[PDB]
Scaffold this active site. Structure first.
Site, PDB file in Angstrom:
ATOM      1  N   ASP A 525       0.897  -1.143   0.113  1.00  0.00           N
ATOM      2  CA  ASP A 525       0.076  -0.008  -0.053  1.00  0.00           C
ATOM      3  C   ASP A 525       0.896   1.368   0.016  1.00  0.00           C
ATOM      4  O   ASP A 525       2.089   1.176   0.177  1.00  0.00           O
ATOM      5  CB  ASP A 525      -1.067   0.084   1.175  1.00  0.00           C
ATOM      6  CG  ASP A 525      -0.109  -0.028   2.588  1.00  0.00           C
ATOM      7  OD1 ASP A 525       0.273   1.089   2.859  1.00  0.00           O
ATOM      8  OD2 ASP A 525      -0.393  -0.855   3.241  1.00  0.00           O
ATOM      9  N   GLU A 605      23.072 -21.803 -16.623  1.00  0.00           N
ATOM     10  CA  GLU A 605      22.323 -20.899 -15.967  1.00  0.00           C
ATOM     11  C   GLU A 605      23.097 -19.895 -15.127  1.00  0.00           C
ATOM     12  O   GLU A 605      22.557 -18.620 -15.172  1.00  0.00           O
ATOM     13  CB  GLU A 605      21.165 -21.643 -14.828  1.00  0.00           C
ATOM     14  CG  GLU A 605      20.266 -22.194 -15.784  1.00  0.00           C
ATOM     15  CD  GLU A 605      19.132 -23.035 -15.069  1.00  0.00           C
ATOM     16  OE1 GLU A 605      19.168 -23.339 -13.771  1.00  0.00           O
ATOM     17  OE2 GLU A 605      18.122 -23.630 -15.685  1.00  0.00           O
TER      18      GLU A 605
HETATM   19 NA    NA Z   1      -2.708   2.172  -1.236  1.00  0.00          NA
HETATM   20 NA    NA Z   2      -2.016  -4.789   0.922  1.00  0.00          NA
END
Ligand code: NA
Ligand code: NA
Ligand code: GLA
Ligand code: GLA
Ligand code: GLA
Ligand code: NA
Ligand code: NA
Ligand code: NA
Ligand code: NA
Ligand code: NA
Ligand code: NA
Ligand code: NA
Ligand code: NA
Ligand code: NA
Ligand code: NA
Ligand code: NA
Ligand code: NA
Ligand code: NA
Ligand code: NA
Ligand code: NA
Ligand code: NA
Ligand code: NA
Ligand code: NA
Ligand code: NA
Ligand code: NA
Ligand code: NA
Ligand code: NA
Ligand code: NA
Ligand code: NA
Ligand code: NA
Ligand code: NA
Ligand code: NA
Ligand code: NA
Ligand code: NA
Ligand code: NA
Ligand code: NA
Ligand code: NA
Ligand code: NA
Ligand code: NA
Ligand code: NA
Ligand code: NA
Ligand code: NA
Ligand code: NA
Ligand code: NA
Ligand code: NA
Ligand code: NA
Ligand code: NA
Ligand code: NA
Ligand code: NA
Ligand code: NA
Ligand code: NA
Ligand code: NA
Ligand code: NA
Ligand code: NA
Ligand code: NA
Ligand code: NA
Ligand code: NA
Ligand code: NA
Ligand code: NA
Ligand code: NA
Ligand code: NA
Ligand code: NA
Ligand code: NA
Ligand code: NA
Ligand code: NA
Ligand code: NA
Ligand code: NA
Lengths: 719, 719, 360
Positions: A525, A605
């Site tokens: 967020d 790799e």
């Molecule tokens: Na956010």
């Molecule tokens: Na979240």
């Protein structure tokens, strides 16, 4: 720009390409007029009035039955006006009455962008931003409500927050407080939300908004894996490249609620803010409470432009880290490589391996502290396990630096295990309800971060560790949801405590690259991005699933924020095998990095790692700063495809992962976006040249696949 | 049947065709196993367990991370178990802690059907029904929860209610209390809900359930026009005649919330019960609170069967009136005929007119009391206006009886106007918040029906009026939503007061036909149907709109409950003209009756009234008692079509209203339902004969229309 | 039970650029006669099958050098080529008789239990308005003659896989090679679609090697087995390249298929999912008396923290009680049809399951 017309009592907010308008009516209510394409008109003409059965009237409307807050569009609707829709504010006053009926008192327009007490928020300078603060009040509730609107013109962003003050003598409680409300008098809409689970976050769900409410939220104490605190309201028919759409993004890492409702009169109300559940926030006489911020934006030109506006806002006006504008070291993380089964010597071996491949940093993940040899003990005991490390942390850091490598470390400061010295000393520091045995999750409990003494203890321990040597990077994790919530202030005050600790940490260690984590993307967020410029996007490191997770995360969040590592196969979360090359292409849509033991890899790799790092570093600025475009939908299409384009549109990197395979394959084209139509572009590896118009309308044919889940990168340069 | 297996701790509820199963787990939690097609299996095998990130564990699960109430399906989930989904119960205890974590204590199986204190509920005898009462408790919350399950085998109905007891010494508050929860571990579903507005109730909205919640409810103090307290969860693909579907119907006339959520693990939770908003219900030590009842049902065979199960349950186990099984007088109502502009002589003229046409009863609607010459005064002043009536009510009733007509009257006992003698004497009897000017709606206020003294005053006035003569019928109306809610017990206690008054009234006047009303269908719910066998379906008497309203109302409610009158044109609500014949066909899907002044009609329309009444009376038993079938969807189709079929399938009445008109019309067929395939049926007017199979597969062609909105009735009799 | 020698045995057919029309055994390549080869295979306890493509001709063939006018073509026009071959004009008796005689000589060399009759391109250069129809009459005439002369033959139809997967062919051949795509995952879709009209018993289906030769995808041996048992079953790989564990899987697969062969071939078939939209490809076969069922499932999608997936059964008796074999748990038909059964959690991609139910 922010304008007040005193005669009409209209406030107009203009960004470069959008207008948001509101009006104080003759009764003092703050009505919402318009949000959309830029206009100098007074949009008050859109308001209409009819006697609508059972939609009743303020006493102050007298005999006018046509005036109802159950019908009219509002900036900040509340419980206690006669409005029966979902509402933004509920106050329970000093006498027990749930009512708030808010009337205009005053306003101010200020240059610059408001800040929020104890909380992350969008920031800008006095030339880039203006702020409108409107004061409303209810004399019976004895509450005063300050609505904050931040206008960032160039970004086409309008932010909203709220401060609520108790102006009476007795205590009130805040029972619901949203940050933002959009009321539409007209329109058919779809609601886009981003749902998931641990290890599969942020799947796109897009459905029409039928009559009733579409709602989602978190009461986990966290923004959550299950529903991200973000919503797009798209007009029916809106695509990636056309049509109206509206975003709301909560700049907050705790609990939230989002509600979208289509009402009895075919109107739409969209709310985002704090959850009403487990939220009964006491406010003493004269005290103020701050609602966390929502970032609103509008696009007339589809979802891709909306997302780009958010990416720009987050990179340039939310993230405060210097690493937004600097190279970020390519890291290798010990977690999937070793889990708890490592020593100091293991870690140095990982540094030696990684140094030979061009990796810049080793991160020692969980398992280094207390007696943490599994996930059943020692959270809270942030003392270095010198037995396991074969010596001190200072010595380990030096041994890693001697290999030419930077050093990072994992912490989980909010948490405690019953089996810890801290818990044996302070069992009351865990969040719990007296007399009740608590929920356990990963066999741990939350510390009560609402308490200063709890936070200070842990902060001091973390400082001792970080002061042992040059630690370039910290991964701050958080591995369970909050339960046993003992009071109605706790969810909010806990998060204030987290942000206080995080601010203290970043201020004390200002050169640290902080990566946020919560079992992957459980707190992915913008509140966290204010502190950490990247967040571990998911514990799912399966390249194919990552195409979906990264796609979903891109609707609001910039590529630069998405922690993404090349991991081993069979993948540890899904059991699926993918090629090393496909894992590389997918993980370059983010921070890049590695999370495996390279000693187990083939020489071929290992050489791929060398070349991958060279590729990522070559395109790092373009990937992190360039304009991002989703070129397919991995839920429905043959491919997962995306691209980044430079500001001047003179350079682009296109990435494709195939998702489906059948015999006698049809030719699949990738259609590009965001180029100059008349410019000529050179594709690097092939040396062929194309116009922007050609690349955007016809695209380019993908080379035929010979194996499953093949991936491609194409680089274009303007001639 | 209700069975307990003590070894597995499984409770099984069987109806004739369905099984509902639950289990007490080893920790004491009451899990939901199954609801669907009848089975003797133990369905505990459907439960699965995995370590799911951030889905945490009761302390009592020890080290078993695979056991979480955030994942498991539950009969009555609550806030305080670690479950983060929408929940059924939230208790705030004597110390301020919101937590309830309920464990099994005991059970009883009883013959017969439980009743609810102060509330309507399904009723049945000891042979027709059994009851399961399960007691759960939380020793820390000091709450005891009694889950009630009522099983009506023949009806394929399971009812649920809840009693909550405070077992501690301090006061607790009930903050959320649902009546029913269905947890599905699997399935893709659509949510059907019935939304609207005043004068356009109960439109069908059917949408897929995407991730997140679809929610709707009422905090209006009433079940509401806007969202009916009813929900169908239909498996994707379910139609009228096939597929699984689940109903929940709230037997309650006050506030409610419905939540349907598709979660992180693709599970579905459906909740119905009281609204959490404006609900903080105090419970003293040792006191019990009763949650109103939900009626659940399941059909494996589509929506039409589900509705039929509800119709049967409501007619035979909810409505208590003798008029369920008796002819109901065909009435004429004065409201659209005269509004407030009438005298006693007007009313007698209406009786004379109506008597000449075969109408049985005149209802004197609003305007007869106080100085009620408009809707701005006199609610609360239930004294007869003898000036307006030209004499006493007793004399008026006698004059109407002398015309051979029965007499009905309108009342609105819950309400008060500021301009009334009652309000000048007792302004504090209105619901209001001290110091705050109240919301007005239709220029009236609610009386506080939570107060006995308020109710008794009005009850006494109403008795004086009803005791003046033989009053065959009362229409009890309620014309605004509740506002100015002053405490957290009020919404619930107000409704207890309403039901107390209504029970007192029905007990004192047991031969009364009571028609419920609330600006039309604003309280069209099974709680009201316990008292009133019909409810005025809508103030919209436009035949075309009534096809939609009546369609929607039929999903849960029987035709016999739907008040429906032939009114004048141009219609008073829409301005639309329809033929007299179409108004008749549409209004016969309900109570029938008239609401116009027949003196204004042509002789041809008066003869149509005569013939309409003969038709309705001929088919009254079939319409009211017969099995109902929706034959089209008026939101999408060319026609609104429905039919009623006798129990023995030997008689059917088919009704059709055309909705669309174009030139060179295609032939439209109506396909019938609910007949015996091999039986031969005679269509009455035409004299043609058809097999049931033919009528159900090919249907019958409608005669070509020559005018707009034409309607048809076809009667079929088995040969 | 049987080895089928597919294309490459005739003329100088060492690739697909020659020899169609030259149905003489390549005894150099076979190291001796066809009769001797058949006997050597019979000496291993195995039946013998062979591939033919009688409707076709390559320019590089003795037949074409002798009779170029036997190819379908338009006079004066150079023809479309497809797989570098042309169609023979099967509307002409003399063309059909020539080839029929050659095929008879081959089939008369020994006990040939099985013939795969293929057809590897579409018709072009259509020279008259009767040709499309008369060509097919010719094909059916040849096919009827062949089946009448060799009435104990198992004839499998083929046309680059399922290019003539139709009931006209099924009148002659009780199975048709369903597709050249032997990728198990794609086969779930092909077999699903084919089931809307055609019985499982008609669908040629073989376990093949991985990486798959058509898609490059890898699938487990077990998933290939479950998928190929929804049809004729069989193998199309060199078992010498397999691990001992995969060879033992073959042994057990054959035992499984033979145990359920009657149920799969004769039982009532039910699609239990849609592989275009769902998490799984699932199907089942139920005996006539509804006393036995075999349920097959292939997972199609994989993510972390997997949700529980249920398979809902169909076609059972609601009140009957059924025993699931491997687990030994018992369930009512009603339970199995409404709630279904939870699938065991996957640990790898594209896992498959078989569940057997028996009425108690
Ligand atoms: Na956010
Ligand atoms: Na979240
Ligand atoms: O226990 C350590 C582990 O914790 C969470 O799962 C993180 O998201 C992982 O990346 C790792 O740090
Ligand atoms: O005022 C009287 C009026 O009140 C409400 O609108 C009712 O629904 C009407 O039928 C009529 O009774
Ligand atoms: O050339 C031989 C080849 O021809 C077609 O492709 C068939 O469908 C295959 O199974 C194989 O017989
Ligand atoms: Na309005
Ligand atoms: Na109102
Ligand atoms: Na109101
Ligand atoms: Na409204
Ligand atoms: Na509005
Ligand atoms: Na407002
Ligand atoms: Na409001
Ligand atoms: Na609250
Ligand atoms: Na608004
Ligand atoms: Na994760
Ligand atoms: Na999410
Ligand atoms: Na909705
Ligand atoms: Na939650
Ligand atoms: Na959540
Ligand atoms: Na999220
Ligand atoms: Na609505
Ligand atoms: Na709208
Ligand atoms: Na909200
Ligand atoms: Na969480
Ligand atoms: Na906070
Ligand atoms: Na984070
Ligand atoms: Na996170
Ligand atoms: Na890339
Ligand atoms: Na990645
Ligand atoms: Na994309
Ligand atoms: Na579970
Ligand atoms: Na939990
Ligand atoms: Na938890
Ligand atoms: Na869940
Ligand atoms: Na569940
Ligand atoms: Na429960
Ligand atoms: Na629960
Ligand atoms: Na509440
Ligand atoms: Na349940
Ligand atoms: Na109405
Ligand atoms: Na409604
Ligand atoms: Na939803
Ligand atoms: Na409401
Ligand atoms: Na409502
Ligand atoms: Na309603
Ligand atoms: Na979800
Ligand atoms: Na579900
Ligand atoms: Na509810
Ligand atoms: Na109402
Ligand atoms: Na009540
Ligand atoms: Na009513
Ligand atoms: Na009503
Ligand atoms: Na209602
Ligand atoms: Na009801
Ligand atoms: Na009718
Ligand atoms: Na009507
Ligand atoms: Na209908
Ligand atoms: Na073909
Ligand atoms: Na033919
Ligand atoms: Na064929
Ligand atoms: Na074929
Ligand atoms: Na075919
Ligand atoms: Na066919
Ligand atoms: Na094929
Ligand atoms: Na199988
Ligand atoms: Na196969
Ligand atoms: Na299938």
């Amino acid at each position: 720009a922010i304008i007040y017309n005193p005669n009409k009592k209209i406030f107009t907010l203009h960004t470069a390409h959008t207008t948001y308008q509101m009006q104080v009516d003759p009764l003092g209510y703050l009505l919402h007029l318009y949000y959309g394409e830029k206009t100098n008109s007074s949009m008050d003409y859109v308001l209409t009035y009819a006697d609508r059965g059972f939609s009743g009237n303020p006493y102050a409307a007298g005999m006018d039955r046509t005036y109802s807050l159950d019908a009219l569009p509002q900036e900040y609707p509340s419980l206690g006006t006669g409005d029966y829709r979902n509402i933004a504010l509920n106050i329970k006053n000093e006498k027990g009455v749930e009512s708030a009926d808010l009337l205009f008192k005053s306003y101010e327009i200020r240059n610059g962008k408001y800040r929020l007490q104890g909380l992350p928020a969008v920031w800008a300078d006095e030339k880039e931003a203006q702020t409108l603060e409107i004061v409303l009040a209810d004399e019976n509730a004895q509450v005063e409500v300050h609505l904050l609107y931040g206008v960032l013109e160039e970004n086409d962003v309008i932010t909203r927050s709220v401060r609520i003050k108790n102006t009476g003598t007795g205590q009130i409680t805040i029972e619901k407080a949203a940050a933002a409300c959009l009321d539409f008098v007209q329109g058919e809409f779809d609601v886009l939300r981003f749902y998931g689970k641990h290890a599969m976050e942020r799947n796109l769900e897009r459905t029409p908004l039928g009559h009733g409410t579409i709602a989602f939220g978190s009461r986990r104490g966290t923004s959550s894996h299950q529903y991200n605190p973000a919503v797009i309201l798209a007009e029916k028919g809106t695509t990636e490249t056309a049509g109206s759409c509206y975003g709301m993004l909560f700049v907050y890492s705790g609990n939230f609620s989002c509600e979208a409702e289509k009402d009895q009169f075919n109107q739409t109300r969209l709310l985002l803010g704090l959850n009403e559940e487990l939220f009964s926030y006491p406010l003493a006489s004269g005290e103020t409470f701050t609602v966390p911020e929502v970032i609103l934006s509008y696009s007339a030109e589809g979802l891709s432009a909306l997302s780009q506006q958010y990416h720009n806002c987050i990179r340039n006006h939310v993230c405060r880290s210097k690493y937004v504008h600097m190279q970020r070291p390519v890291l290798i993380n010990s977690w999937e490589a070793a889990y708890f089964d490592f020593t100091g010597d293991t870690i140095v071996d990982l540094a030696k391996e990684a140094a030979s491949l061009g990796i810049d940093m080793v991160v020692m993940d969980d398992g280094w502290f207390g007696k943490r040899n599994d996930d059943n003990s020692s959270l809270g005991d942030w003392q270095v396990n010198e037995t396991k490390l074969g010596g001190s942390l200072a010595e380990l850091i030096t041994r890693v630096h001697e290999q030419g490598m930077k050093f990072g470390i994992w912490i989980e400061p909010e948490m405690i295990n019953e089996d810890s010295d801290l818990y044996r000393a302070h069992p009351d520091w865990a969040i719990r309800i007296q007399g009740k045995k608590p929920v356990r999750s990963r066999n741990q409990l939350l510390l009560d971060f609402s308490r200063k003494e709890v936070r200070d203890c842990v902060f001091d321990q973390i400082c001792v560790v970080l002061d042992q040597g040059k630690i370039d990077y910290v991964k701050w994790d958080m591995n369970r949801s909050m339960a046993d919530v003992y009071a109605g202030n706790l969810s909010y005050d806990y998060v204030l405590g987290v942000y206080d600790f995080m601010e203290r940490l970043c201020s004390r260690y200002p050169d640290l690259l902080l990566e946020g984590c919560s079992g992957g993307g459980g707190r992915f967020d913008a509140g966290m991005l204010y502190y950490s410029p990247q967040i571990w996007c998911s514990d799912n490191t399966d390249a194919i699933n990552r195409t979906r997770i990264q796609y979903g995360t891109s609707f609001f969040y910039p590529v630069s924020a998405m922690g993404a590592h090349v991991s081993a196969v069979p993948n540890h979360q899904t059991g699926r095998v993918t090629s090393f090359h496909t894992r590389g292409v997918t993980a370059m849509a983010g921070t890049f990095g590695y999370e495996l033991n390279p000693a187990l890899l083939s020489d071929e790799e290992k050489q791929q790692i060398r070349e991958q790092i060279k590729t990522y570093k070559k395109y790092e600025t373009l990937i992190n700063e360039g304009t991002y475009w989703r070129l397919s939908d991995p839920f429905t299409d043959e491919i997962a495809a995306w691209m980044s384009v430079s500001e001047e549109q003179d350079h682009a990197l296109v990435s494709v992962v195939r998702l489906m395979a059948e015999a006698n394959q049809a030719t699949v084209y990738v259609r590009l976006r965001g180029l100059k139509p008349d410019a000529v572009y050179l594709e690097e590896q092939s040396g062929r040249q194309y116009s922007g118009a050609a690349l955007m309308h016809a695209g380019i044919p993908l080379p035929p696949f010979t194996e499953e889940y093949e991936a491609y990168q194409f680089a274009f340069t303007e001639l």
